[PDB]
Amino acid sequence: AMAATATDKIGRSVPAPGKGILTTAREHHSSVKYASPNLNMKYRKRQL
């Protein structure tokens, strides 16, 4: 379903593990009061 890679940030320890892969869950919550047709499969289907 998904496959992703991420680097982390400025650093000086090559073997230290980091949180770049957190980015796979990135999404924008500034405007979120009403549900989004794009997430609703019935809508997507109707459009197809």
């Binding site: 650093g11 000086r12 320890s13 073997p15 230290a16």
Partner: protein
């Protein structure tokens, strides 16, 4: 113990005695290189 510690930490970072000031910490002198911090702490435990 100040000559012995200065020399062991200086020789590990591969720098002359004047390059390493005694006022600075092991974490400071090492930068982010925690691989080298673990070696200095292992060497100080072996020594004293």
């Amino acid at each position: 113990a100040s000559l012995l510690l200065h020399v062991l930490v200086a020789h590990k970072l591969k720098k002359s005695l004047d390059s390493i000031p005694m006022s600075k910490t092991i974490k400071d002198l090492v930068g982010g290189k925690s691989t080298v911090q673990n070696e200095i702490l292992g060497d100080l435990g072996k020594e004293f």
